[PDB]
Amino acid sequence: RLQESISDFYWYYSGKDVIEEQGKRNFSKAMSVAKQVFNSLTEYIQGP
Amino acid sequence: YGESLCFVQHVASGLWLTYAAPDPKALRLGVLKKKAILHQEGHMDDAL
Amino acid sequence: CGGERYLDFLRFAVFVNGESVEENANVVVRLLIRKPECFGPALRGEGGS
Amino acid sequence: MSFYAALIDLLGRCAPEMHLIQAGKGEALRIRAILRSLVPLDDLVGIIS
Amino acid sequence: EVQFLRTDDEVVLQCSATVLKEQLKLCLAAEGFGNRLCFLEPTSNAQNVPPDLAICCFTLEQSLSVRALQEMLANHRTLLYGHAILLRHAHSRMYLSCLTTSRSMTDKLAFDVGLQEDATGEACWWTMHPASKQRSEGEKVRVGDDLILVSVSSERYLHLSTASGELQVDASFMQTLWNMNPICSCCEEGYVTGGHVLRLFHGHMDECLTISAADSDDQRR
Amino acid sequence: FMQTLWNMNPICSCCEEGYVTGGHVLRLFHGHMDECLTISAADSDDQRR
């Protein structure tokens, strides 16, 4: 679901040359959430 | 338990357990219950 | 009688200070077409005066 | 009559503002086409008459 | 493994109608040249009467998200619920579209479904949605899945009209379940596949199987 | 004080985790556990048939 949201928000900003400040912020929030999710998934399997 | 997907078949007839595909106006009744029938082909989602 | 009240609520939701709010207007249109019985026994389509 | 009048008023209010139409915004054009399909003009004129 | 519909695959759109308490399966069909409108070709009596599948076959070009489609208009891939697909008539190389015209005496709000010469615009694009609860948006479309098709331009459903005694196809706010049944996915070089026009040559390509020319006495039989 | 011969016929010895065994009360769910197979409630017209 998160990557679908990120791809949609991409497509929203694709045409515009420069992303604005709020877009940067929301991208940062989404990427932080995705990083934590990736670390959780990594921790589920490591050991292995 | 809870992983295997099973289709119920009447041995003698070979029919498959399926729903009746509620006739229209059932949504108007707001009736959420689907009568169970035995049909030669059935539906894909018939698994249990 | 109740369709009218719900409709004027939606009117106040979508129309502000002489101008339409597209974000709410499009949602209202889509929801209303998805449930077309809100339009009335008329405007139904099939078998509709 | 009041239910239908409220419905028509709400749809007209949901209708796009013109400046978007001149801008050629696809969502606005699509909404307007949907509204026109729902409500034909002859019926509006008949009611006004 | 379970087969997944993907782009460049050829499909037929199939609907089910109950007539005289016998189920009848129909395929969407369009000639394109001469008549752009879509109609329904029954496939059930096939054992006794061959159907015309060539004009019932469609090829998927693109399956995109709504946002990607919006950017495209402003300026192999697996199918997923919620995406917008572009469908070509294989014979006529036109695009399936929701037309502004309406003939349906029964339904006032309905539109005609037919073919479009170019892929430009929103009419040619359609969005797939799951028919049942176990399917959800974002999930891969699977062969045999019942689907709901919505036009971007008109926000109608691809619908089967039984209002008149004769069956018809229309764009309506009422929904009809459709099945995207595959025909071909990927063919190797040579390696004849079914559904293809070809010629039969006896030996070293000197003479071929044929029937009589026009206005012949044999009646071309 | 009179004796009768009896047979001790087995039903189950040891069952692995999950791995449905016969003779068990259970429920049948269509898909993602939203709805289940059942019959009508009490005092229903269908006679719970």
* C4 interfacial to chain E (CB closer than 8 Å): no
Q: Which amino acid would we find at residue D47?
A: I
Any residues with CB less than 8 A from the CB of E116 and at least 6 apart, and which? E36, E94, E95, E96, E97, E99, E123, E124
CA–CA distance, E110 with E94 (Å, rounded to integer): 22
CA-based diameter of chain A, in Å?
44
Residues of E in contact with C48 (CB under 8 A): 108
Helix (H) or strand (E) holding B19: strand B16-19
Antiparallel, parallel or unpaired: β E157-161 and E168-172? antiparallel
Helix (H) or strand (E) holding D8: helix D2-14
| Residue whose entry in the numeric block shows the structure tokens 């991208």 | A27
Among C15, C41, E173, smallest CA distance to D9 is for: C15
Q: E27: burial class by Cβ within 10 Å (0-12, 13-18, 19+)?
A: buried
Judge whether A4 is annotated as a binding position. no
| Residue whose entry in the numeric block shows the structure tokens 């009117």 | C11
CA–CA distance, E152 with D30 (Å, rounded to integer): 9
DSSP chain C: -HHHHHHHHHHHHHEETTEE-HHHHHHHHHHHHHSGGGG-STT-STT--
- Note every long-range contact of C23-31, with CB atoms under 8 Å and residues 24 or more positions apart, other chains counting: C25/D13, C25/D14, C25/D15, C25/D16, C25/D31, C26/D14, C26/D27, C26/D31, C28/D10, C28/D14, C29/D11, C29/D14, C29/D31, C29/D34, C29/D35, C30/E155
| Chain E nearest CA to F30, separation (Å) | 9
Using an 8 Å Cβ cutoff, are E61 and E77 in contact?
no
> Which chains contact C through at least 3 pairs of Cβ atoms less than 8 Å apart?
D, E
* C40 interfacial to chain E (CB closer than 8 Å): no
Reported resolution in A?
Answer: 2.6
Among E96, E102, E101, smallest CA distance to E121 is for: E96
For D34, which of E70, E73, E154 is closest by C-beta distance?
A: E154
Q: What is the 3-state secondary structure (H, E, C) of chain E?
A: CCCECECCCEEEEEEEEEECCEEEEEEEECCCCCCCECEEEECHHHHCCCCCCHHHCEEEEEEECHHHHHHHHHCCCECECCCEEEEEECCCCCEEEECCCCCCCCCCCCEEEEEECCCCCCCCEEEEEECCCCCCCCCECECCCEEEEEECCCCCEEEEECCCCCCEEEEECCCCCEEEEEEECCCCCCCCCCCCCCCCECCCCCCECCCCCCCCCCCCC
* F25 interfacial to chain B (CB closer than 8 Å): no
Using an 8 Å Cβ cutoff, are E116 and E123 in contact?
yes
Using an 8 Å Cβ cutoff, are E160 and E169 in contact?
yes
CA–CA distance, E125 with E96 (Å, rounded to integer): 8
Nearest chain F residue (CA) to E132: F31
The per-type count for chain B, helices as H runs and strands as E runs, is: 1, 2
Structure tokens at E5: 């519909």
DSSP state letter for B39: E
Nearest chain E residue (CA) to C34: E173
Helix (H) or strand (E) holding B16: strand B16-19
Cβ neighbours around D11 below 10 Å, total: 23
What 3-state class would DSSP assign to F28? coil
CA–CA distance, B18 with B7 (Å, rounded to integer): 9
C-alpha distances in angstroms, B33 versus B36, B48, C35, E44, F36?
9, 16, 21, 31, 10
Window E:130-149, CB contacts with B under 8 Å: 132, 134, 144-146
| Chain F nearest CA to E131, separation (Å) | 14
Any residues with CB less than 8 A from the CB of F45 and at least 6 apart, and which? none
Any residues with CB less than 8 A from the CB of E203 and at least 6 apart, and which? none
Using an 8 Å Cβ cutoff, are E139 and E80 in contact?
yes
Q: Which amino acid would we find at residue E46?
A: A
Antiparallel, parallel or unpaired: β E58-64 and E10-19? antiparallel
Using an 8 Å Cβ cutoff, are E5 and E142 in contact?
yes
CA–CA distance, E30 with E21 (Å, rounded to integer): 27
- Note every long-range contact of E16-20, with CB atoms under 8 Å and residues 24 or more positions apart, other chains counting: E16/E177, E17/E160, E17/E162, E17/E167
Chain E residue set in contact with C, beta carbons under 8 Å? 106-110, 155, 163, 172-174
CA–CA distance, E184 with E196 (Å, rounded to integer): 11
C-alpha distances in angstroms, E105 versus E95, E109, E153, E164, F16?
26, 10, 22, 9, 64
| Chain F nearest CA to B5, separation (Å) | 9
CA–CA distance, E70 with E125 (Å, rounded to integer): 11
The per-type count for chain A, helices as H runs and strands as E runs, is: 2, 0
CA–CA distance, B15 with E218 (Å, rounded to integer): 51
Residues of E in contact with C46 (CB under 8 A): 106-107, 163, 172, 174
